[PDB]
Amino acid sequence: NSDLDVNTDIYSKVLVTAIYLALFVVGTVGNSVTLFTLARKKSLQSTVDYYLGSLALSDLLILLLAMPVELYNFIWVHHPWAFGDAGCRGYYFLRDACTYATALNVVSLSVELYLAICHPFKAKTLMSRSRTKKFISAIWLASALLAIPMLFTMGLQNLSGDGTHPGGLVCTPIVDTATLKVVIQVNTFMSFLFPMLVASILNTVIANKLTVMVHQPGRVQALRRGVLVLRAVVIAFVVCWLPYHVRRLMFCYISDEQWTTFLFDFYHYFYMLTNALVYVSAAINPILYNLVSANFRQVFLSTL
């Protein structure tokens, strides 16, 4: 069956694979070393160490689980799917879950930073470490809950001619067009638009209030660092995840009569692009930490 074949040249495949492996080593090393750094730490920074830690985790997972599977079955061999039903559902579930976790962690970091720069005297009277860990757990669980629909949206289908050819066994939405549009819309709003709009607003307010504070010790230095970092994280998240959601909307909103061979090949090269950006997002955070902070850089190099 040559109907499930994706027409992308070997050049793009090798290139994307190379970029993928680079982001793999840089990302995994960066995030793992980040975790180990936050482990041997020793006070709101100690809380943002949890958040950061969480983020690292949310990256590592995607780098250690999502990347190999996606490389193989989504870049190198589009059919048949080789990880079964549980792999099919679990993949997308993990994807969405980690996305939600990352976004919520970003917004939470925005709020915590705001409280850090506006009411530091009320902030030192701190939400305890235990309550912070509880909040991280709450974020993760909420992310899983919001990722639930992927367990029922995706599955295995035999898209071969007779529907009996083992090579036609692919991982795909096992749901009609309209409902798919619905869950994709929900994910686009809740994992991207809404929390990043909130985070961007909060970061603008953070910038302004930082300016006001400057106009009013090492607390100012660390605060400014946190501001620039968080800004960079929000911007990077938006930029990296923007084309991704556009593609998934493109997947279900284009009618059958409009789908040409051009739009097909383009869809898959665009898949390469958007997902490459996704892994860029998966590898960006530890790089930013090393640039802005001399300390974290020294400890990062202490491990390595």
């Binding site: 109907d3 499930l4 994706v6 989504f74 589009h78 997308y92 995706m154 289908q157 898209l159 692919v170 991982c171 795909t172 939405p173 998934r248 997947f251 059958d256 789908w259 097909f264 869809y267 898959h268 898949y271």
Partner: peptide
């Protein structure tokens, strides 16, 4: 045809 990979 239509893509099957989301």
């Amino acid at each position: 045809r239509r893509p099957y990979i989301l």
